């Protein structure tokens, strides 16, 4: 609990590693100091994983196809390469959308080149052109094609950019080549960056000279919300009850058309800084569009973000913001009154990818819960700068934590709840600790906004206080 105790725990956990691994992993574990701004003096992140240590990180293809491009519903996304990458990522992410799957929406579908040995030895550019022709024949209502490279594409010297250029020119279709090979970078973060660069270079400038879109002073675009279980809709209904017009959604339930309309908006509301800060900065430097970070996890963050957003517009939007806050106050007050006495004082350990380890702390604290440990798979040092002030003093911070490290930290700290991915869920469930999926919301949600807060409180109470956690020990043992 104390800082010295946490440091000693870190040292004894590191004791098992060989010299090089221990030296490297020592720089990725820290005891939180909320008064520290530059986390580079405290923690190190965005480095390569130690070999053979059960890392939880995904690849660049996961960060590009699985995160940024996949949620776009009217576009068809080709996993270029062998079958595995597309098969394991099909429908695993709950980026919710409205559409007719197979006809005008294709999110849950798995399009792939299905590389065989001949495609490795002789290349697959001809196969990619033939595949684009087949996609055009069989899915006429698609509004664009993206080609997400898997690991072999870069290694075998394939030129997807030339094929994309030729096929786009021939069919007048937006074909976006993405060099998101899994071996690139260290994690999904470089996948985010590559996907953002692809968006900038192939989609975002499509309507630069188009002036047929009637713009209003209240034009905003939601960036970095991938509609996990409907989160983006729960945020959008709040933003539009405030008198704003959400022109675009990036990219959950997102269409290519509204991505092309994003340069016309007045403000860019960035939810996931990690995955879309590149495109937000590009839009600021090109179109002069300001962008601001907002948090809709829990009533406190939701109200603070709504007021911050309304302060960017005229007083009418501020009045509507006050109206929305007054309208939703009884609902989340009733949710808190019901569920906080059931969750007050319960300690939570989080390990999610790049934004939620710090973004969901406010929602947990709204129910009396305390976050004692947080960590990221692939965050950068700016994310830790934002995280340090959010966490309490002497709490644990982990970057690219290993399975062994996470297990030992959980065994020592003994949290009441753990929020992490599917690869930790059953490990910690067999240990007797209630677990919540903080990626897929345990197939529940949404968690954004006030309705999302109601669902979140219900889920936290139902899992933390479930009777099954009092039954792991046999009465005769």
């Amino acid at each position: 609990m104390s800082r010295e105790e946490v440091e000693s725990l870190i040292q004894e956990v590191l004791e098992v590693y060989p010299e090089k691994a221990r030296k490297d992993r020592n720089k990725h574990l820290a005891v939180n100091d909320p008064a520290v701004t530059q986390s580079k003096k405290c923690i190190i992140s965005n480095k390569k994983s130690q070999p053979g240590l059960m890392t939880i990180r995904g690849c660049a293809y996961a960060g590009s196809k699985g995160v940024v491009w996949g949620p776009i519903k009217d576009m068809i996304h080709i996993s270029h390469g062998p079958v595995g990458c597309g098969q394991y990522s099909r429908a695993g992410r709950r980026n919710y959308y409205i559409g007719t799957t197979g006809v005008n929406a294709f999110v849950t579908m798995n399009f792939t080149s299905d590389f065989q040995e001949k495609d490795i030895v002789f290349g697959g550019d001809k196969k990619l052109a033939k595949l684009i022709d087949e996609v055009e024949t069989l899915f006429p209502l698609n509004k664009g094609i993206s080609v997400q490279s898997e690991c072999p594409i870069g290694l075998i010297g394939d030129d997807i950019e030339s094929v994309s250029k030729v096929k786009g020119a021939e069919l007048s279709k937006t074909i976006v080549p993405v060099r998101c090979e899994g071996f690139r970078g260290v994690s999904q973060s470089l996948g985010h960056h590559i996907a953002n660069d692809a968006v900038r270079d192939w989609v975002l400038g499509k309507r630069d000279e188009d002036t047929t879109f009637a713009s209003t002073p209240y034009d905003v675009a939601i960036i970095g919300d991938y509609n996990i279980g409907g989160d983006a809709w729960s945020s959008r209904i709040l933003l539009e009850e405030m008198g704003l017009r959400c022109v675009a959604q990036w990219s959950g339930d997102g269409s290519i058309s509204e991505i092309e309309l994003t340069p016309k908006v007045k403000l860019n509301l960035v939810h996931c800084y990690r995955s879309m800060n590149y495109i937000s900065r590009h839009m600021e430097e090109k179109y002069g569009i300001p962008w601001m970070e907002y948090n809709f996890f829990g009533p406190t963050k939701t109200i603070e973000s709504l007021r911050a957003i309304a302060a960017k517009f005229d007083e009418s939007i501020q009045k509507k913001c006050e109206e929305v806050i007054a309208k939703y106050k009884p609902e989340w007050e009733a949710v808190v009154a019901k569920y906080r006495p059931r969750l007050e004082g319960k300690r939570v350990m989080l390990y999610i990818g790049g934004l939620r380890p710090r973004h969901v702390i406010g929602a947990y604290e709204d129910l009396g819960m305390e976050v004692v440990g947080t960590g990221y798979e692939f965050a950068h040092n700016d994310d830790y700068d934002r995280t340090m002030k959010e966490m309490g003093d002497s709490t644990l911070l982990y970057d690219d934590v290993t399975g062994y490290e996470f297990e030992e930290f959980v065994k020592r700290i003994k949290p009441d709840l753990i929020g992490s991915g599917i690869k930790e869920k059953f490990i910690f469930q067999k240990m007797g600790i209630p677990f919540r999926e903080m990626h897929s919301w345990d197939y529940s949600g949404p968690y954004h906004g006030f309705d999302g807060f109601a669902i979140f409180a219900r889920d936290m109470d139902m899992t933390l206080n479930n009777p099954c956690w009092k039954k792991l020990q046999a009465p005769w043992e």
Binding site: V83, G102, C151, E181, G229, S255, G403
Partner: protein, 522 residues
């Protein structure tokens, strides 16, 4: 808006009026959506025969594949050995995906490591990655064995697994006597089951190739049973139970049943059960080796016949009545043990269930998919039941296996309307079940979307999905089921007949319209 008494999740919260209006406003103002008439026209076109011809003329695009890549099966094979860590030389994203896939199917922890090959290794190779990873894995997770497969990156780069392991041992990163069996698992060749075969052959070769001088066939009086890529715990259990009932010594090589079914008793077990290294070393001394799934154990069969000199019996997967019978006769012949009265009684009870449910099972049409041995066993069982497997699809099947399945169909009057499709995917099957509608589909969770598509054509066009195979993600604890032996045939028959009866109940639940056939007794 939410009421704290009845909190709505996404369904049916987003069916509220305000959410409906917000979604309509978004779609009309910014999505540039196609007209609903156009969307309906395109869907109706996709349900036609002309669309089926266009879909089956595909040669480069794969839509909704029914297969995975080799290292997943290699990891599953490695999971079946005692205190054995699966280790994939290559990029970490593959390992994250493998672990997530098996976590969602089994709802259990899945242990696997990678050496995190980064683009700096994309030119020089992964030798340093191999050395550091082997040392780190052995120090941190303390396995008695590290079983090595590869990702597509390492296979394309051409990393030499044998030389890298030898250099790691020579440089003292890992002890020279520490077992590190390996296999090359190119994800662009074959599928996950091919990876399982390659990993098993690597481990068997590692433990046996240099020690065949003192091996004598039949000296330990046991039978080697190789399950293959198996995702039902009940199949391991039923094989072990049937062999134990017969009084037959056996060695289940690559038994992951314990590690994939660890109890929740307050502690986490990274390793549980599994084939021991002594068992693998003594395997050549066995009387014979029986492959449960021969159609994806070709390399293992070649090695066992050519090195251990075991005369591997030509056996189908022990699925259904006849094939389980033949498996029991062959095991009796190899071991000399008679088939006990308990197994005879179980066979008679399966026959009794067959005769009880034949009226409802007769003439039903099925579109099925999965792994080759699983689907041929399913087809054989359906033929034994009087059902018609109209659409047989195996994305990872080959031409000789298709010849075998066609021969199986030819021997039965109920295989006359049956077609086998190799190299086809679930979009092909969607066209098949639209143009040639069966009564039911049998397959993994990926088939649910097909059902949704059929329901969009009409309730009279909906084809229900029966979840038998791998992976099953939208149902809980179906991985504990059995498909092998008499008990597996019983479970499959019960599921099929009760699926038919549930569908009939739903069709005849309309009061004063169809409930004249809503019989209490069926």
């Amino acid at each position: 808006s939410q009421q704290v008494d009845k909190i709505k999740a996404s369904y049916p919260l987003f069916l509220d009026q305000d959410y409906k209006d917000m979604l309509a406003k978004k779609r009309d103002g910014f999505e540039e959506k196609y007209p609903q008439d156009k969307i309906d026209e395109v869907f109706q076109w996709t349900t036609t025969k002309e669309y089926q011809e266009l879909n089956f003329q595909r040669e480069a695009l794969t839509v909704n594949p029914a297969k995975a890549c080799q290292p997943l099966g290699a990891v599953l094979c490695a999971l079946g050995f005692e205190k054995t860590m699966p280790y994939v030389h290559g990029s970490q994203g593959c390992v994250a995906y493998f672990r997530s896939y098996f976590n969602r199917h089994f709802r259990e922890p899945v242990s696997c490591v990678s050496d995190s090959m980064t683009e700096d290794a994309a030119v020089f190779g992964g030798q340093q990655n191999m050395k550091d990873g082997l040392q780190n894995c052995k120090a941190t997770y303390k396995p008695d064995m590290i079983a090595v497969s590869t990702t597509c990156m390492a296979e394309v780069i051409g990393d030499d697994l044998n030389a890298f392991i030898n250099n790691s041992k020579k440089e003292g990163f890992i002890p020279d006597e520490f077992p590190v069996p390996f296999a090359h698992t190119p994800s662009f060749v074959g599928s996950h089951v091919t990876g399982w075969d390659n990993m098993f052959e690597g481990i068997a070769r590692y433990f046996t190739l240099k020690s065949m001088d003192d091996k004598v066939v039949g000296s330990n009086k046991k039978i080697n049973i190789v399950p293959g890529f198996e995702t039902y715990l009940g199949n391991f259990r039923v094989i072990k139970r049937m062999l134990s009932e017969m009084g037959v010594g056996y060695s289940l090589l690559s038994d992951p049943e314990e590690v994939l079914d660890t109890p929740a008793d307050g502690q986490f077990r990274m390793y549980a059960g599994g084939t021991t290294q002594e068992e693998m070393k003594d395997a050549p001394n066995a009387l014979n080796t029986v492959l449960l799934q021969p159609w994806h154990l070709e390399k293992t069969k070649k090695f066992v016949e050519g090195t251990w000199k075991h005369e591997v019996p030509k056996l189908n997967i022990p699925m259904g009545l006849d094939w389980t019978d033949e498996f029991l006769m062959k095991v009796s012949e190899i071991s000399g043990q008679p088939i006990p009265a308990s197994l005879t009684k179980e066979r008679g009870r399966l026959v009794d269930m067959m005769t009880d449910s034949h009226t409802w099972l007769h003439g039903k049409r099925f579109a099925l998919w999965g792994d080759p041995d699983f689907v041929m066993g399913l087809v054989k069982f359906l033929l034994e039941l009087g059902c018609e497997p109209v659409h047989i699809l195996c994305h990872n099947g080959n031409k000789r296996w298709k010849k075998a399945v066609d021969a199986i169909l030819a021997a039965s009057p109920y295989g006359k309307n049956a077609t086998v499709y190799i190299g086809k995917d679930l979009w092909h099957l969607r066209s098949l079940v639209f143009t040639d509608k069966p009564d039911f589909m049998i397959g993994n969770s990926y088939g649910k979307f097909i059902q949704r598509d059929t329901l969009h054509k009409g309730k009279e066009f909906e084809v229900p999905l029966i979840r038998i195979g791998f992976p099953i993600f939208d149902r809980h604890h179906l991985h504990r089921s059995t498909t092998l032996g008499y008990e597996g045939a019983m479970q499959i028959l019960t599921t099929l007949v009760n699926s038919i009866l549930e569908r009939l109940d739903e069709e005849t639940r309309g009061m004063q319209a169809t409930d004249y056939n809503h019989d209490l007794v069926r």
